[PDB]
Design a protein around this motif. Structure first.
Motif, PDB file in Angstrom:
ATOM      1  N   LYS F  43       0.823  -1.205   0.000  1.00 14.04           N
ATOM      2  CA  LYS F  43       0.000   0.000   0.000  1.00 14.04           C
ATOM      3  C   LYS F  43       0.858   1.256   0.000  1.00 14.04           C
ATOM      4  O   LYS F  43       0.417   2.319  -0.452  1.00 14.04           O
ATOM      5  CB  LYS F  43      -0.942  -0.013   1.201  1.00 14.04           C
ATOM      6  N   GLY F  44       2.089   1.154   0.493  1.00 15.54           N
ATOM      7  CA  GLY F  44       2.987   2.290   0.524  1.00 15.54           C
ATOM      8  C   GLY F  44       3.957   2.321  -0.635  1.00 15.54           C
ATOM      9  O   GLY F  44       4.945   3.062  -0.614  1.00 15.54           O
ATOM     10  N   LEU F  45       3.687   1.508  -1.653  1.00 13.12           N
ATOM     11  CA  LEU F  45       4.575   1.460  -2.809  1.00 13.12           C
ATOM     12  C   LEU F  45       4.559   2.694  -3.722  1.00 13.12           C
ATOM     13  O   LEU F  45       5.664   3.115  -4.109  1.00 13.12           O
ATOM     14  CB  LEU F  45       4.297   0.182  -3.617  1.00 13.12           C
ATOM     15  N   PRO F  46       3.425   3.321  -4.105  1.00 10.24           N
ATOM     16  CA  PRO F  46       3.521   4.417  -5.095  1.00 10.24           C
ATOM     17  C   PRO F  46       4.137   5.717  -4.592  1.00 10.24           C
ATOM     18  O   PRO F  46       4.114   6.708  -5.329  1.00 10.24           O
ATOM     19  CB  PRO F  46       2.062   4.641  -5.515  1.00 10.24           C
ATOM     20  N   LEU F  47       4.678   5.760  -3.374  1.00  8.97           N
ATOM     21  CA  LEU F  47       5.388   6.957  -2.935  1.00  8.97           C
ATOM     22  C   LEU F  47       6.825   6.967  -3.443  1.00  8.97           C
ATOM     23  O   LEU F  47       7.533   7.970  -3.301  1.00  8.97           O
ATOM     24  CB  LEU F  47       5.355   7.051  -1.410  1.00  8.97           C
ATOM     25  N   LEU F  48       7.276   5.865  -4.042  1.00 11.57           N
ATOM     26  CA  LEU F  48       8.680   5.759  -4.426  1.00 11.57           C
ATOM     27  C   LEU F  48       8.921   6.259  -5.848  1.00 11.57           C
ATOM     28  O   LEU F  48       9.917   6.941  -6.109  1.00 11.57           O
ATOM     29  CB  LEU F  48       9.153   4.315  -4.278  1.00 11.57           C
ATOM     30  N   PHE F  49       8.028   5.925  -6.778  1.00 13.36           N
ATOM     31  CA  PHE F  49       8.242   6.221  -8.193  1.00 13.36           C
ATOM     32  C   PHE F  49       7.980   7.701  -8.458  1.00 13.36           C
ATOM     33  O   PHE F  49       7.005   8.266  -7.954  1.00 13.36           O
ATOM     34  CB  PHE F  49       7.339   5.344  -9.053  1.00 13.36           C
ATOM     35  N   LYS F  50       8.848   8.330  -9.257  1.00 13.31           N
ATOM     36  CA  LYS F  50       8.724   9.746  -9.585  1.00 13.31           C
ATOM     37  C   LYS F  50       8.758  10.049 -11.078  1.00 13.31           C
ATOM     38  O   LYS F  50       8.078  10.980 -11.515  1.00 13.31           O
ATOM     39  CB  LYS F  50       9.826  10.555  -8.877  1.00 13.31           C
TER      40      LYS F  50
END
Lengths: 164, 164, 164, 164, 164, 164
Positions: F43-50
């Motif tokens: 659930k906290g995965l899409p904070l990494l990709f930019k």
């Protein structure tokens, strides 16, 4: 845990009131927020100084016992706490020049005149000086005894600032 | 938890209404969120000042003791609640330039009109000035007496904007 | 847990007395502040040496079995631990020059004198050497036997500095 | 404790769909990750708005009483929440050009298609549009009805890309 | 505590003896200090490599399973234990240049002489070579047969250095 | 506590094996050291990709259920895992040119040849290929069948490197 490993700010000793006040306030609020005891605080003090303040601390280390006197010494040796006659000579030195805003002028004069011993000067005496020293561009429109308090001088000054 | 160590927002003393209002809003929101006591908030207050306003805070330190009085003292000198005729002459000194969206326009107009004394204008009067002041891209398709509430003007504007 | 992870203070062997003295002082204060035990500090010692000196620690590791002998070896191999006679023949070595602030001179003298063994020189004796070494811009108006405490020299020197 | 202290993601109102969509997505994932409750998130909302938008939040604060209506208002006032028909008339809008990597094209198409309502288009239907829009460097050797899974298109496209 | 997250030291693959030995010393000290298990240390090992040595570690990943075998595999390719005749021809390819202190000289000479097979040279044989190597600043005051143990040479050198 | 607020490293998607391996290894060791559960991790995965990886993740979000398959997909879409014949064509492309060190050459060839399926090639075939790919400056002094293992080739190569 950790106790005085480093900090965000450190000390430099540059003979100024604002820098030493900011440093001592940041050190006090860090000591309050972290929970460091008073006995651990003095022993962890020489990790902060880096400039010629550290060879100042190498001399007067034995002169201090508790945290209170050791913190009082930092205000004593680096902030001069000027006597009366030099401050009284300083306020009457520089007249207000042209193209200068009234607000920053009265701000600098109040910050200069706040350093005297308290209780010697109420708002009536302080109110005489700014009106007495303003350019003739301001003194024509506003007379003495019209502005009772200190806000009214800036209030009637901003209107003559607006029209100009 | 926390005793006002360090945060993002900072003050400069720019003498505009927007920055001064944003600063007070951010500080008064952070104080209510983090759970900082009323007395303890004042002792950490000069950590935020960085500029000419430090010279300002050095002069009036003896004036305020309570947090509400210090907040009003911060409001009184910078954002001075300018009188009515300046606002009424300002709401007509700028028309709507072309290729400008209606949202930022109505936001700036409401933020400039909210400085008036409350209870002096109903909902109908405010709706009249906004309809008349807009670019002729909008007036030819939106005539007067169609809209009454202030939301339906934006509702009938965004459709004409999307249609282009 | 955790003992000697890393810090800013690292040692490189630059053959100067000031750098090695600051390194030994910083490590000695960190040992008392962080609470690292005596027997556990010898194992975590080569995490600091990242220089030519890590080649040096491979050669003479077996000579040390305690922390005190290791610290004395690190002092002895790089710093000649100057005795008292060179300090006394180096204090009078230089005088005071023109246009120099008195505080820097007093700080240099006390920092160069504090390396003597403690308990052999009280306050009356230290004062005479500094008084004798002072510039005749200061010695004309500030004679001996008017000052008793060490603060009186700075407090009477600042007035002659301001008078110009 | 602690809720919405600060982060990198701040919103400024730049009138573009991509920035507001990334901001709403990042805040919505942070709310589920950190565990901030529903009723407590409305109080800590203006710590993010440090822009023209903090003037905007003073105007329309009373329209929101829940977090969902506040999020819908923040979407509605700045982003026109494009419907399905503009998406379908914008997907076939552009074709594939020469010297373009197939992975970037497939990523753009799936990212532009994933905004549709979920459950209306299965896997067989999507393949037809991509196959129809393929650049005839790829369509000569890779015909329809040889691929079934969506991975087979990339896995058979990389060989034709390598063959050159 | 800790499972080898990140540290200061890093490797490059420079093919010199000193950097490769310092790297292994730092890693083997950190593993014993922090309390990292023997199996768990290998899974965090490619986080340290940054360079051409990553290409090296990608080739021999299937070779080592135990930490000691991986350490010997790291030692074998970079610092290759060069034969005796290279060392014996190297200890005579450099005399002692002038104004050079004796400590770094004897440190480099012992670090280069410790590559030989142990048990092939007594204590007496090393001293004659060091004496022959020294500059004529030292040989005229220190003659042969005065010193026997390797420490007394430095002890009788530092006095002549201090005397200058 | 905290869980995937940010990190030291983030992802960019630049079509390289080393960058994605470093990223996935740092993410795995951070997840292991922090103690984050598997349910909280996805659930906290899409904070990494930019970069354009986030519009790649906007497409294939519903394709993954657990942390294992979602981590497997990142290796599948960005690392190509090349087939056999291109790797076999690549090793015989570039002959060893002049003024190039033997060690970096055999290092790059081993890193290239390690990507094949395991168990197809022992150490006897690899030595023959290495002997085959070298200049006549090396092939004159060392013949085949003298170097049995793989260390002996570099061992006899460094001696002819030394004399040159």
């Amino acid at each position: 845990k950790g106790s005085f490993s480093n900090c965000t700010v450190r000390f430099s000793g540059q003979r100024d009131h604002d820098a030493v006040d900011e440093f001592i306030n940041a050190v006090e609020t860090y000591k309050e927020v972290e929970g460091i005891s008073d006995k651990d605080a003095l022993k962890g003090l020489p990790l902060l100084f880096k400039s010629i303040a550290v060879v100042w601390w190498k001399g007067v280390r034995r002169d201090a016992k508790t945290w209170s006197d050791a913190l009082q010494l930092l205000r004593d040796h680096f902030s001069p706490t000027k006597p009366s006659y030099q401050i009284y000579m300083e306020i009457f030195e520089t007249k207000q020049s042209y193209d200068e805003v009234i607000d920053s002028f009265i701000c600098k004069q109040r910050a200069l005149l706040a350093k005297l011993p308290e209780g010697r000067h109420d708002e009536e005496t302080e109110l005489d000086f700014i009106y007495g020293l303003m350019q003739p561009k301001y003194r024509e429109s506003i007379p003495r005894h019209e502005v009772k308090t200190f806000r009214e001088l800036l209030d009637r000054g901003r209107t003559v600032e607006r029209t100009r």
